[PDB]
Amino acid sequence: IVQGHNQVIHQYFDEKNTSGVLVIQTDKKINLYGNALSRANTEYVPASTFKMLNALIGLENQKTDINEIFKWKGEKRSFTAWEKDMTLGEAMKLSAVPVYQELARRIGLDLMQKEVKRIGFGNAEIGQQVDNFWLVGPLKVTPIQEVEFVSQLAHTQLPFSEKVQANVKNMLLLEESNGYKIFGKTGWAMDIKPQVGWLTGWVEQPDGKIVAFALNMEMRSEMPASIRNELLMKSLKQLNII
Ligand SMILES: *C(=O)[C@@H]([C@@H]1NC(C(=O)O)=C(S[C@H]2CN[C@@H](C(=O)N(C)C)C2)[C@@H]1C)[C@@H](C)O
Numbered sequence: 001i002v003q004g005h006n007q008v009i010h011q012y013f014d015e016k017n018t019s020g021v022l023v024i025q026t027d028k029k030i031n032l033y034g035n036a037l038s039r040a041n042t043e044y045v046p047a048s049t050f051k052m053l054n055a056l057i058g059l060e061n062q063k064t065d066i067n068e069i070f071k072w073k074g075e076k077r078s079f080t081a082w083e084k085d086m087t088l089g090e091a092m093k094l095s096a097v098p099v100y101q102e103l104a105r106r107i108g109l110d111l112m113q114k115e116v117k118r119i120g121f122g123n124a125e126i127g128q129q130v131d132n133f134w135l136v137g138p139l140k141v142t143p144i145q146e147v148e149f150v151s152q153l154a155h156t157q158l159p160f161s162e163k164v165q166a167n168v169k170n171m172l173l174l175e176e177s178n179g180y181k182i183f184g185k186t187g188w189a190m191d192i193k194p195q196v197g198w199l200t201g202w203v204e205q206p207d208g209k210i211v212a213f214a215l216n217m218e219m220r221s222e223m224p225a226s227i228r229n230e231l232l233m234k235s236l237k238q239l240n241i242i
Helices: 002-015 037-041 047-060 088-094 097-107 109-119 143-154 162-170 227-238
Strands: 020-026 029-034 173-177 180-189 195-204 210-219
Touching: 002 029, 002 227, 020 037, 020 143, 020 227, 029 037, 037 143, 037 210, 047 088, 047 097, 047 109, 047 143, 047 162, 047 180, 047 195, 088 097, 097 109, 143 162, 143 195, 143 210, 180 210, 180 227, 195 227, 210 227
Parallel strands: none
Antiparallel strands: 020 029, 020 210, 173 180, 180 195, 195 210
16 A cells, blocks of 8 residues: 555655655654655754744744844845845745744743743753754754644644744745645755755645645755755655645
8 A cells, every 4th residue: 555655755765866754644644655764763953944843932922923024134144045134934934044043042042942841842952052952953853753743733733822823834835736735844954964854844635634744854965955845746746645
């Protein structure tokens, strides 16, 4: 059943010379696909995917709001795409680190550690460095843990206000094709051991049904960033999720 599906998806991953897993959660049922299934319960830095929880915490605790404009004071950033004023929602789409760092600072280390622990995100360790704990360690999370987190978000089942959850969900819309809405958040940790690529989110099918996913793969600098999107869409289509 899944073995035919997984044979095809295994091949997708082989064809593009990487080791990756794709975790799918429909409701409470979790299946693994890809050519590196052991990745599914291996911890990795969440990188840019932590922005989902960052936003939830920041909004919940009233440190910002969806309308606030975070102004670019003019300093050069790691990507030219980030060099403009933006809202929290626009920063999510662009993975604009400086905006989310300013947010994390507003929250403070101790509120951050408290919230991360209350929610139970990954190993729930943030250490003492308020602006890179989700990039270089100690914070670590499995792909299975990521899919459960985003599934809960999609079902408005996380322990945050309903409206905060709706607001963060609205920041996460990637793609809308043939009535299927694709929500998600990419992440690419470029400066660590083996580079880590993420793409974590869910599909809202036309009848309202939600199928959540977490792609996690080894990245190499020669890859286009869109290889994560490619492997996701090809797999979802092959699974008839889209
Ligand atoms: C988060 O993991 C890093 C962040 N994420 C990320 C990516 O997932 O590709 C880039 S965002 C920036 C680089 N390319 C442009 C883009 O949005 N995409 C290719 C999707 C803008 C960057 C590495 C963050 C920790 O730096």
